[PDB]
Amino acid sequence: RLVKGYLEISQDGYGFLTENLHNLESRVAIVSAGLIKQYALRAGDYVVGQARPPRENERYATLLKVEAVNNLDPEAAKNRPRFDELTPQFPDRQIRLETTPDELSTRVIDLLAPIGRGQRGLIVAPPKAGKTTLLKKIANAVLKNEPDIKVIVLLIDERPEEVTDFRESVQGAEVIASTFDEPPQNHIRVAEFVHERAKRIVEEGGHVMILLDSITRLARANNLVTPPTGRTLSGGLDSAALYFPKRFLGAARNIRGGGSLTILATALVETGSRMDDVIFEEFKGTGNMELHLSRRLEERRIFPAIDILKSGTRREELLLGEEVTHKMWLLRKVLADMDPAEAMEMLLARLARTKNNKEFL
Amino acid sequence: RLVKGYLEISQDGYGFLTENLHNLESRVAIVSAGLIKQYALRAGDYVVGQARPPRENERYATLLKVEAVNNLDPEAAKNRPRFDELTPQFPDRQIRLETTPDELSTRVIDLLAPIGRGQRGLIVAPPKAGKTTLLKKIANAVLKNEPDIKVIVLLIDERPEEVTDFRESVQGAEVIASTFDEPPQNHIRVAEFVHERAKRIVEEGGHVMILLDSITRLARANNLVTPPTGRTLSGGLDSAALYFPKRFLGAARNIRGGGSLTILATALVETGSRMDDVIFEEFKGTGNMELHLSRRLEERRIFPAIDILKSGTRREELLLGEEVTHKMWLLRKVLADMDPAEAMEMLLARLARTKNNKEFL
Amino acid sequence: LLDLSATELEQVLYFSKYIVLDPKGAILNGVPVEKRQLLTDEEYRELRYGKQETYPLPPGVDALVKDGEEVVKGQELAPGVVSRLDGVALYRFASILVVKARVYPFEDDVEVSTGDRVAPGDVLADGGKVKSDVYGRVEVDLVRNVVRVVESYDIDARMGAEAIQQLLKELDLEALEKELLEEMKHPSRARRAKARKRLEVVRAFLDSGNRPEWMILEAVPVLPPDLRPMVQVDGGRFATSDLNDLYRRLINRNNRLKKLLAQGAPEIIIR
Ligand SMILES: Nc1ncnc2c1ncn2[C@@H]1O[C@H](COP(=O)(O)OP(=O)(O)O)[C@@H](O)[C@H]1O
Ligand SMILES: Nc1ncnc2c1ncn2[C@@H]1O[C@H](COP(=O)(O)OP(=O)(O)O)[C@@H](O)[C@H]1O
Ligand code: BEF
Ligand code: BEF
Ligand SMILES: [Mg+2]
Ligand SMILES: [Mg+2]
Numbered sequence A, B: 001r002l003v004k005g006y007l008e009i010s011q012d013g014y015g016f017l018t019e020n021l022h023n024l025e026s027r028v029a030i031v032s033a034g035l036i037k038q039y040a041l042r043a044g045d046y047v048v049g050q051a052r053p054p055r056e057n058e059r060y061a062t063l064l065k066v067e068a069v070n071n072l073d074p075e076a077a078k079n080r081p082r083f084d085e086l087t088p089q090f091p092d093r094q095i096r097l098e099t100t101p102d103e104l105s106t107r108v109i110d111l112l113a114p115i116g117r118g119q120r121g122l123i124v125a126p127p128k129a130g131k132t133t134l135l136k137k138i139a140n141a142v143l144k145n146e147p148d149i150k151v152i153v154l155l156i157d158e159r160p161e162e163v164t165d166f167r168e169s170v171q172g173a174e175v176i177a178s179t180f181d182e183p184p185q186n187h188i189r190v191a192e193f194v195h196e197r198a199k200r201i202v203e204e205g206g207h208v209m210i211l212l213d214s215i216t217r218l219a220r221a222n223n224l225v226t227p228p229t230g231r232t233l234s235g236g237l238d239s240a241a242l243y244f245p246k247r248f249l250g251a252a253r254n255i256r257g258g259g260s261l262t263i264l265a266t267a268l269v270e271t272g273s274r275m276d277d278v279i280f281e282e283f284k285g286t287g288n289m290e291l292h293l294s295r296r297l298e299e300r301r302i303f304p305a306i307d308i309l310k311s312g313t314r315r316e317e318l319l320l321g322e323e324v325t326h327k328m329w330l331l332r333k334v335l336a337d338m339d340p341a342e343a344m345e346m347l348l349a350r351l352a353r354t355k356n357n358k359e360f361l
Numbered sequence C: 001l002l003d004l005s006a007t008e009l010e011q012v013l014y015f016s017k018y019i020v021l022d023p024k025g026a027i028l029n030g031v032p033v034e035k036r037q038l039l040t041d042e043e044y045r046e047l048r049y050g051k052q053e054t055y056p057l058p059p060g061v062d063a064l065v066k067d068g069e070e071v072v073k074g075q076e077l078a079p080g081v082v083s084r085l086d087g088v089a090l091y092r093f094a095s096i097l098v099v100k101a102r103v104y105p106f107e108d109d110v111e112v113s114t115g116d117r118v119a120p121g122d123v124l125a126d127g128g129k130v131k132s133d134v135y136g137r138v139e140v141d142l143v144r145n146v147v148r149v150v151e152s153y154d155i156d157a158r159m160g161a162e163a164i165q166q167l168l169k170e171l172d173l174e175a176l177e178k179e180l181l182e183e184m185k186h187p188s189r190a191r192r193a194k195a196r197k198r199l200e201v202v203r204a205f206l207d208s209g210n211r212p213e214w215m216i217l218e219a220v221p222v223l224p225p226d227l228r229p230m231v232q233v234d235g236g237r238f239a240t241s242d243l244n245d246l247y248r249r250l251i252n253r254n255n256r257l258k259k260l261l262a263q264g265a266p267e268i269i270i271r
Helices: A033-039 A103-112 A131-145 A160-171 A184-203 A215-225 A243-251 A273-284 A296-298 A322-336 A340-352 A354-358 B033-039 B103-111 B131-145 B158-171 B186-204 B215-225 B243-250 B274-284 B296-298 B321-337 B341-351 B356-360 C008-015 C039-047 C160-168 C173-183 C191-207 C242-263
Strands: A004-008 A014-016 A029-031 A047-054 A120-125 A151-155 A174-178 A207-213 A253-255 A258-269 A289-293 A306-313 B003-007 B015-017 B030-033 B046-050 B120-125 B150-158 B175-178 B207-213 B252-256 B260-268 B290-293 B305-311 C054-055 C069-071 C087-092 C095-101 C099-107 C122-125 C131-133 C136-143 C145-152 C231-232 C237-239
Touching: A004 A029, A004 A184, A014 C087, A029 B252, A047 C173, A103 A131, A103 A306, A103 A340, A103 A354, A120 A131, A120 A273, A120 A354, A131 A151, A131 A207, A151 A160, A151 A184, A151 A215, A160 A174, A174 A184, A174 B131, A184 A207, A184 A215, A184 A243, A184 A258, A215 A243, A215 A273, A215 B296, A215 C131, A243 A258, A243 A273, A253 B033, A258 A273, A273 C122, A289 A296, A296 A340, A306 A322, A306 A340, A340 A354, B015 B046, B030 B033, B046 B186, B046 B260, B103 B131, B103 B305, B103 B321, B103 B341, B103 B356, B120 B131, B120 B243, B120 B274, B131 B150, B131 B260, B150 B186, B158 B175, B186 B207, B186 B215, B186 B243, B207 B215, B215 B260, B215 B274, B243 B274, B252 C237, B260 B274, B274 C087, B274 C160, B290 B296, B296 B341, B305 B321, B305 B341, B305 C039, B305 C160, B341 B356, C008 C160, C087 C099, C087 C145, C099 C131, C122 C136, C122 C145, C131 C145, C173 C191, C237 C242
Parallel strands: A120 A258, A120 A289, A151 A174, A151 A207, A207 A258, B120 B260, B120 B290, B150 B175, B150 B207, B207 B260
Antiparallel strands: A004 A014, A004 A047, A014 A029, A253 A258, A289 A306, B003 B015, B003 B046, B015 B030, B252 B260, B290 B305, C054 C095, C069 C087, C087 C095, C099 C145, C122 C131, C136 C145, C231 C237
């Protein structure tokens, strides 16, 4: 009998193999602390192997033997560089975006904010501004442009119908979701579980792509979870709650030893609540990309409703050639002075005619 | 067998010799309180001496003998004026700034904010405003203009890539860094260790610079660490947390008995939090150098994005000659009326032509 | 049970510090190797390294000894300094230390390492030509290119309740019982009376089953909560059964112990 799951080590030194729901389940497979010690297994590690039905007085199946960890033979787990020990650098491997149903969005992103491997990015938009649809477009574009990259879609505290739509529209990439019907605790628990899985995969030199809707809602859950910290930050945020989300986001990085962790998440702003704005400003100093969407552009029904001037990456030179760098510089110089909505209109009209590279010519 | 390090005196009267990582390390060397008493030695003092392998039941090697303290014979350690007893005065000796890859940045610094030895300085800019790049330029220009001075770079709560880029771009100068992945305790510990080392060096009449990226993040760690203090300052700042950064920055001074500590640090403003602004205005009264960078100038890609009008020193006369003082006074008079971006574009045009002395000519 | 000074030496080692190990303190101390007696670590140190007797040399005053010169107990290491025990007097930059040891100059590679304790015949240096014919620790001083075998041969150390519980576990009872049977049935009352006095507890343990290996305390259970009640008297004052008043202190005790064992080993402090 074979079982599989993702390793979750308990405080007691033994662990369990989890399902896709990312929570304790009846059919989780017990993993003795021993196996963990011999194989140097770590939280989030994907474990597959033969198991046996639990003996009398046992409530969960026990892993008789381990076969493969993270889809590879266990021996390499004993000797491997730890994720924390991996050198963080810039993403030196740009990812071109193109999605058939709306490639305007992909080309505008490429002309506004290029993508690399190991990316620490963020999209910032008020409610109802294409942030969710934009994330869907990026997901579809990546699942057409970088199939090699493990695409995990994480949806925290968001609309269930959107979860169903993305699950159906993600063509099989791991969609992990925890709607707003869940308490903050479920959100956070799924958070560390997915995150550790990703870091364990990257430990093996893999490229992992994370598309996280509602990073701000995750920060809200962390704040609801921080037990006191004592004082409260400006706006009603907790001083120490944001440490965890910061660590989550800063985990994204490029590795000179192979593999990368690229996290792109959705941020909410102009909500009239100081929590959101403080969270955004806090995350901006940690992320390498901001991409801004304007509520007024959405009001006029112009998509993608991107605020071009505020949007951009850092170290575009490392993701684009000299020609593309100077072209984007020219395009921003031309567009720098224009009003948001009308600038986006001219950009769409100019990109609607043809593809971006031939738009250059 | 010889060992070396910087002294960390424990509460118990004995100390340990540390490595560049500025943390308890397995290779640290034990130092008996007795030795400390003979050599009147102090924390942060650099100690070199022959050591022996630890005996049975000893976890750390023991310094059999002290050979050199702070690169000199231990005798002077017994007889020497004490750092806190050193007379604090103005920087009375200029440091000219010139760096080949960007002479314009050091140029505008010299024409706006010239640097003496013992300088208590600050550069104030929003995120993404040439602040860190500017600090890199100052580091390189120091390493070309003042190679004799012990150049120390400190990076707190900042971005790993910046760390590595400075390791390669500092050309071997002692840099101590602690990215944002580390907790504030690590930051505070490392900062105080380097602080004390620097004070010990200046105790011997030495010249030092601390290039401290993110002094505001260091203040953030101080706030997070201060246990209560009771009342909280407006903006989310703790009252007694800032005492430590205030002392820390105030350490920079000119010494009439030789040597001096200069500290140039990077400040964040216009970040949307009262906390950053309160820190800025609080440090501004202790520092003698404010150099302002404008976000709008960066948006136009005009560099260095310096806000000329807000920038300046205090007691230029002690650091500049009458001709240079009147040159810069004429310049500022011309320049008060112009707008930030226009002033910088025009200044870059005028300075791109010739050396600054030839610019005056 | 442990044939001990049950009253004095017991607490003497439990609270004051005394080295004890059974295997071999083979090297002499005025009396030959001791087997299970406890010692003060001062003499165990002096033994540890032969006999180093260091005496300062007045400034500008040259010593009357050589660096690798044999100096006997009582010899003047300098015009005013007088040695107190034999060995080789070695120079210090400044002083002279006569370490009780036998000297073996080497002109070839050294064969013993300073620290190793070598038996008579064991090679010290230069291969089989420089050999140690003395038990004890070795100091290979290239200062004059000699290997000095101090008489200090391998004698280790132990202390406190850990050694206590070790000896506990280090004892098999039926051996003691047979010996005590001999000590009563043959000998006279003066000694056999106490022999049986201990044999009685020996019988208790042996026939009882359970080992005394847990005779001492290492995992102290913690009273159920209400059992030592904390009752709210009024207005905020608390009336607590004194057990907690001691539990708290115990916790603090153990906590700082953990801290210092993680932080550093100030042996006086640790004890
Ligand atoms: N590119 C687009 N094309 C058509 N409709 C869009 C687009 N972007 C946003 N919308 C509209 O905006 C609404 C919500 O935007 P979306 O990003 O999906 O969620 P959010 O409310 O988080 O922004 C949707 O009902 C959708 O009709
Ligand atoms: N003098 C300059 N030349 C070229 N680029 C610059 C210059 N100053 C700033 N930049 C741009 O600003 C970005 C980051 O600015 P930085 O100084 O790190 O932020 P901050 O000023 O807030 O510390 C870099 O990606 C860089 O391209
Ligand atoms: F309107 Be969005 F879903 F915040
Ligand atoms: F480099 Be900036 F402080 F974002
Ligand atoms: Mg939405
Ligand atoms: Mg910066």
